[PDB]
Amino acid sequence: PGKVVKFSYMWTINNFSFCREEMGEVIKSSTFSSGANDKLKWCLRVNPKGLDEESKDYLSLYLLLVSCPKSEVRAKFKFSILNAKGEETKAMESQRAYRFVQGKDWGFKKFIRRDFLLDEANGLLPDDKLTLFCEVSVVQ
């Protein structure tokens, strides 16, 4: 069977300034699929108030391999925010392809400062919506 080997996932979280998650609490995205027969399952994990005390001023963003048929998947990834114009901004990308196993995630604990994100001047929460964009390339 053929495989979806590169995929871009776009997720809008409504009313973001009112998310109620505390530090260490997660918002999980819908599961999205790739690979052969949709057998690689992924989701994005957002911690709106970080993981720990070190990151409580940040939003943390992680890509999680929810399911895979074998042991591992190696993948490169890039996260960004889509601004009020639909353009990518505040991008961060993996240094190389990282080894995912099922239940494992990789990402950025300090992806963006909350006070920058919440400042209307920066155009990152049009209508109080945060739109995240995740581009993945599976190399093995």
Residue numbers in the entry: 26 to 165
Task: Provide passages from the article that reported this PDB entry.
Speckle-type POZ protein (SPOP) is a ubiquitin ligase adaptor that binds substrate proteins and facilitates their proteasomal degradation. SPOP is composed of three domains: the meprin and tumor necrosis factor receptor-associated factor homology (MATH) substrate-interaction domain and two dimerization domains, bric à brac, tramtrack, broad complex and bric à brac, tramtrack, broad complex and C-terminal Kelch. Among the regulatory signals that control Pdx1 stability and function is a degradation pathway wherein Pdx1 associates with a ubiquitin ligase adaptor, speckle-type POZ protein (SPOP). Notably, neither SB motif in Pdx1 conforms to the established SB consensus sequence, but high-resolution structural characterization suggests that the Pdx1 SB motifs share a binding mode with other substrates.
We also present, to our knowledge, the first X-ray structure of SPOP-MATH without bound substrate. F102, W131, and F133 are frequently mutated in prostate cancers, which results in reduced affinity of SPOP for substrate proteins. There is no evidence to suggest that global structural changes contribute substantially to the energetics of binding, as comparison between substrate-bound and substrate-unbound SPOP–MATH structures reveals only minor side chain conformational changes upon substrate binding. In the structure of unbound SPOP–MATH, the electron density maps support modeling of Y123 in two different positions, but in substrate-bound structures, the residue instead adopts a single conformation.
